[PDB]
Amino acid sequence: VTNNIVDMQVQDTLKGAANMLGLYLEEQFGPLSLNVAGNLVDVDGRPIEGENDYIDRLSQSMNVVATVFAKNGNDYIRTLTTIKDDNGERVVGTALDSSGDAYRTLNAGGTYFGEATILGSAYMTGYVPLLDRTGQAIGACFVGVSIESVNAILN
Numbered sequence: 001v002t003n004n005i006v007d008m009q010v011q012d013t014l015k016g017a018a019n020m021l022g023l024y025l026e027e028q029f030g031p032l033s034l035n036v037a038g039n040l041v042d043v044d045g046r047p048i049e050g051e052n053d054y055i056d057r058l059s060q061s062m063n064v065v066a067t068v069f070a071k072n073g074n075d076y077i078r079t080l081t082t083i084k085d086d087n088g089e090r091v092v093g094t095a096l097d098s099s100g101d102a103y104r105t106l107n108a109g110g111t112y113f114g115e116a117t118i119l120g121s122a123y124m125t126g127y128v129p130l131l132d133r134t135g136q137a138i139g140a141c142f143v144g145v146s147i148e149s150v151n152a153i154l155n
């Protein structure tokens with residue numbers, strides 16, 4: 001019973017947080033676009049990289065990790081993220097695994113909710129397309145909870 005409750009809580013958290021992230025970006029930046037170099041920019045053409053205040057707040061309040069990807073070609077590059085490597089640096093510049101179903105789902109214009117590996121470890125994830133004012137996909141928003149964190153709750 002409690003295990004199923006925890007699983008449903010994780011899923012509800014991710015559904016809520018994935019849509020909140022899109023709303024947070026709209027509040028922070030307004031509509032986003034890609035510049036010639038393939039970087040996410042606001043209406044003024046100002047790049048968003050390093051402006052992590054809202055995504056950090058979302059991560060803290062919903063207890064998720066979170067990422068905003070830029071779409072370059074069919075690839076998705078982490079632009080804003082709360083995921084960190086062992087040295088404490090945010091994993092900006094890493095890419096979504098091109099062999100995974102989350103990548104295929106996003107390139108097909110869909111959303112992905114399910115388990116996925118990120119940089120070597122397993123997470124429960126939500127990946128949602130990010131669109132510009134014309135409806136064109138310019139990236140993706142992601143929220144996740146590590147399987148390690150889920151197992152810690154269950155124990």
Ligand code: NA
Pocket residue numbers: 097099100101
């Ligand atoms: Na994979």
